[PDB]
Design a protein around this motif. Structure first.
Motif, PDB file in Angstrom:
ATOM      1  N   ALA A 188      -4.283   4.636 -17.154  1.00  0.00           N
ATOM      2  CA  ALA A 188      -3.194   5.203 -16.396  1.00  0.00           C
ATOM      3  C   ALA A 188      -1.964   4.340 -16.321  1.00  0.00           C
ATOM      4  CB  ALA A 188      -3.623   5.453 -14.945  1.00  0.00           C
ATOM      5  N   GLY A 189      -2.111   3.020 -16.566  1.00  0.00           N
ATOM      6  CA  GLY A 189      -1.032   2.070 -16.476  1.00  0.00           C
ATOM      7  C   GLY A 189      -0.993   1.372 -15.141  1.00  0.00           C
ATOM      8  N   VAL A 190      -1.801   1.800 -14.135  1.00  0.00           N
ATOM      9  CA  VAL A 190      -1.861   1.144 -12.839  1.00  0.00           C
ATOM     10  C   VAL A 190      -3.289   1.153 -12.372  1.00  0.00           C
ATOM     11  CG1 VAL A 190       0.411   1.166 -11.810  1.00  0.00           C
ATOM     12  CG2 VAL A 190      -0.983   3.317 -11.889  1.00  0.00           C
ATOM     13  N   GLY A 191      -3.630   0.201 -11.473  1.00  0.00           N
ATOM     14  CA  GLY A 191      -4.886   0.157 -10.766  1.00  0.00           C
ATOM     15  C   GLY A 191      -4.616  -0.633  -9.522  1.00  0.00           C
ATOM     16  N   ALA A 192      -5.428  -0.453  -8.453  1.00  0.00           N
ATOM     17  CA  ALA A 192      -5.156  -1.083  -7.178  1.00  0.00           C
ATOM     18  C   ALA A 192      -6.452  -1.497  -6.539  1.00  0.00           C
ATOM     19  CB  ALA A 192      -4.389  -0.163  -6.207  1.00  0.00           C
ATOM     20  N   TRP A 193      -6.370  -2.463  -5.591  1.00  0.00           N
ATOM     21  CA  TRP A 193      -7.484  -2.865  -4.766  1.00  0.00           C
ATOM     22  C   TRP A 193      -6.898  -3.473  -3.520  1.00  0.00           C
ATOM     23  CZ3 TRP A 193      -6.292  -5.599  -9.180  1.00  0.00           C
ATOM     24  CH2 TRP A 193      -5.976  -6.961  -9.071  1.00  0.00           C
ATOM     25  N   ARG A 194      -7.671  -3.481  -2.405  1.00  0.00           N
ATOM     26  CA  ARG A 194      -7.187  -3.954  -1.127  1.00  0.00           C
ATOM     27  C   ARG A 194      -8.178  -4.906  -0.533  1.00  0.00           C
ATOM     28  NH1 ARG A 194      -7.019   0.915   3.404  1.00  0.00           N
ATOM     29  NH2 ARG A 194      -5.990  -0.924   4.469  1.00  0.00           N
ATOM     30  N   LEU A 195      -7.664  -5.851   0.292  1.00  0.00           N
ATOM     31  CA  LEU A 195      -8.453  -6.764   1.080  1.00  0.00           C
ATOM     32  C   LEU A 195      -8.276  -6.335   2.508  1.00  0.00           C
ATOM     33  CD1 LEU A 195      -7.613 -10.369  -0.307  1.00  0.00           C
ATOM     34  CD2 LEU A 195      -9.592  -8.898  -0.915  1.00  0.00           C
ATOM     35  N   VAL A 196      -9.400  -6.132   3.229  1.00  0.00           N
ATOM     36  CA  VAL A 196      -9.395  -5.721   4.612  1.00  0.00           C
ATOM     37  C   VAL A 196     -10.260  -6.706   5.346  1.00  0.00           C
ATOM     38  CG1 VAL A 196      -8.946  -3.307   4.197  1.00  0.00           C
ATOM     39  CG2 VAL A 196     -11.356  -4.158   4.255  1.00  0.00           C
ATOM     40  N   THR A 197     -10.288  -6.602   6.693  1.00  0.00           N
ATOM     41  CA  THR A 197     -11.054  -7.464   7.558  1.00  0.00           C
ATOM     42  C   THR A 197     -11.739  -6.546   8.527  1.00  0.00           C
ATOM     43  OG1 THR A 197      -9.033  -7.980   8.846  1.00  0.00           O
ATOM     44  CG2 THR A 197      -9.908  -9.674   7.348  1.00  0.00           C
ATOM     45  N   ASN A 246     -17.939 -14.668  13.031  1.00  0.00           N
ATOM     46  CA  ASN A 246     -18.537 -13.358  12.851  1.00  0.00           C
ATOM     47  C   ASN A 246     -17.562 -12.334  12.304  1.00  0.00           C
ATOM     48  OD1 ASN A 246     -19.948 -14.787  15.300  1.00  0.00           O
ATOM     49  ND2 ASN A 246     -21.588 -13.492  14.367  1.00  0.00           N
ATOM     50  N   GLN A 247     -16.553 -12.795  11.525  1.00  0.00           N
ATOM     51  CA  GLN A 247     -15.545 -11.958  10.920  1.00  0.00           C
ATOM     52  C   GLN A 247     -15.703 -12.189   9.455  1.00  0.00           C
ATOM     53  OE1 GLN A 247     -13.760  -9.971  12.983  1.00  0.00           O
ATOM     54  NE2 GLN A 247     -14.806 -11.181  14.628  1.00  0.00           N
ATOM     55  N   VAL A 248     -15.555 -11.116   8.648  1.00  0.00           N
ATOM     56  CA  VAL A 248     -15.718 -11.167   7.216  1.00  0.00           C
ATOM     57  C   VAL A 248     -14.483 -10.537   6.642  1.00  0.00           C
ATOM     58  CG1 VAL A 248     -18.223 -11.123   7.222  1.00  0.00           C
ATOM     59  CG2 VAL A 248     -16.925  -8.935   7.097  1.00  0.00           C
ATOM     60  N   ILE A 249     -14.213 -10.825   5.350  1.00  0.00           N
ATOM     61  CA  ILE A 249     -13.123 -10.241   4.612  1.00  0.00           C
ATOM     62  C   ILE A 249     -13.765  -9.585   3.421  1.00  0.00           C
ATOM     63  CG2 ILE A 249     -12.700 -12.552   3.658  1.00  0.00           C
ATOM     64  CD1 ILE A 249      -9.741 -11.617   3.154  1.00  0.00           C
ATOM     65  N   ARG A 250     -13.487  -8.273   3.238  1.00  0.00           N
ATOM     66  CA  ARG A 250     -14.112  -7.464   2.222  1.00  0.00           C
ATOM     67  C   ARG A 250     -13.032  -6.985   1.305  1.00  0.00           C
ATOM     68  NH1 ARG A 250     -19.537  -5.819   3.393  1.00  0.00           N
ATOM     69  NH2 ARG A 250     -20.442  -7.495   4.781  1.00  0.00           N
ATOM     70  N   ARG A 251     -13.371  -6.813   0.005  1.00  0.00           N
ATOM     71  CA  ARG A 251     -12.507  -6.193  -0.967  1.00  0.00           C
ATOM     72  C   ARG A 251     -13.011  -4.789  -1.095  1.00  0.00           C
ATOM     73  NH1 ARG A 251     -10.623  -7.911  -7.199  1.00  0.00           N
ATOM     74  NH2 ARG A 251     -10.072  -9.892  -6.056  1.00  0.00           N
ATOM     75  N   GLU A 252     -12.106  -3.797  -0.923  1.00  0.00           N
ATOM     76  CA  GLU A 252     -12.462  -2.402  -0.942  1.00  0.00           C
ATOM     77  C   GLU A 252     -11.733  -1.768  -2.105  1.00  0.00           C
ATOM     78  OE1 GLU A 252     -14.745  -0.727   1.292  1.00  0.00           O
ATOM     79  OE2 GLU A 252     -15.117  -2.914   1.433  1.00  0.00           O
ATOM     80  N   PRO A 253     -12.325  -0.778  -2.780  1.00  0.00           N
ATOM     81  CA  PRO A 253     -11.758  -0.136  -3.950  1.00  0.00           C
ATOM     82  C   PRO A 253     -10.666   0.830  -3.567  1.00  0.00           C
ATOM     83  CG  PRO A 253     -13.878   0.923  -3.427  1.00  0.00           C
ATOM     84  CD  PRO A 253     -13.679  -0.280  -2.506  1.00  0.00           C
ATOM     85  N   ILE A 254      -9.668   0.996  -4.461  1.00  0.00           N
ATOM     86  CA  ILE A 254      -8.635   1.994  -4.342  1.00  0.00           C
ATOM     87  C   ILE A 254      -8.615   2.538  -5.737  1.00  0.00           C
ATOM     88  CG2 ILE A 254      -6.226   2.663  -4.044  1.00  0.00           C
ATOM     89  CD1 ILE A 254      -5.851   0.142  -2.296  1.00  0.00           C
ATOM     90  N   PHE A 266     -11.943   8.469 -10.525  1.00  0.00           N
ATOM     91  CA  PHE A 266     -11.294   9.429  -9.671  1.00  0.00           C
ATOM     92  C   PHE A 266      -9.972   9.742 -10.308  1.00  0.00           C
ATOM     93  CE2 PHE A 266     -14.095   7.190  -6.729  1.00  0.00           C
ATOM     94  CZ  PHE A 266     -14.727   8.262  -6.091  1.00  0.00           C
ATOM     95  N   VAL A 267      -9.763  11.010 -10.737  1.00  0.00           N
ATOM     96  CA  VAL A 267      -8.485  11.459 -11.253  1.00  0.00           C
ATOM     97  C   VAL A 267      -7.611  12.066 -10.174  1.00  0.00           C
ATOM     98  CG1 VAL A 267      -9.223  11.732 -13.618  1.00  0.00           C
ATOM     99  CG2 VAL A 267      -9.476  13.682 -11.967  1.00  0.00           C
ATOM    100  N   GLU A 268      -8.117  12.220  -8.924  1.00  0.00           N
ATOM    101  CA  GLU A 268      -7.316  12.771  -7.851  1.00  0.00           C
ATOM    102  C   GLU A 268      -7.942  12.449  -6.521  1.00  0.00           C
ATOM    103  OE1 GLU A 268      -7.446  17.189  -8.575  1.00  0.00           O
ATOM    104  OE2 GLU A 268      -8.390  17.163  -6.562  1.00  0.00           O
ATOM    105  N   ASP A 269      -9.029  11.640  -6.535  1.00  0.00           N
ATOM    106  CA  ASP A 269      -9.987  11.465  -5.465  1.00  0.00           C
ATOM    107  C   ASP A 269     -10.880  12.664  -5.320  1.00  0.00           C
ATOM    108  OD1 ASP A 269      -9.416   8.676  -4.803  1.00  0.00           O
ATOM    109  OD2 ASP A 269      -7.516   9.524  -4.021  1.00  0.00           O
TER     110      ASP A 269
END
Lengths: 48, 48
Positions: B20-29, B40-48, A16-19
């Protein structure tokens, strides 16, 4: 019948270059040089 | 992290760091029971 989507697409290069999803194989930028070679080849072929 | 949505975020991290020099990822519940863990709760890693 599925509880998940039965179609899982492969992507060789992906990102994704801009989403807005952009992706490519390997033939994307071979278009430019290849037609340039062919152009030079058919200049001199007409002279011969 | 059985779901492949976690592994997508790993591939984005290493690729975009170089480019690009940066990349990101997030942990959500969230609430899922298709890969259940305790309470019955899970923790998922979602892409950014």
């Amino acid at each position: 019948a599925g509880e998940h989507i039965p179609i899982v697409p492969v992507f060789g290069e992906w990102g994704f270059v801009e989403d807005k999803e952009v992706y490519e194989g390997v033939v994307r930028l071979t278009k430019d040089g290849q037609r340039l070679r062919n152009m030079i080849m058919s200049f001199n072929a007409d002279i011969v | 992290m059985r779901h492949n949505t976690a592994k997508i975020a790993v591939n984005i991290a290493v690729r975009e760091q170089i480019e690009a020099g940066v990349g990101a990822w997030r942990l959500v519940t969230d609430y899922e029971d298709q890969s259940p863990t305790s309470n019955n709760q899970v923790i998922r890693r979602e892409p950014i």
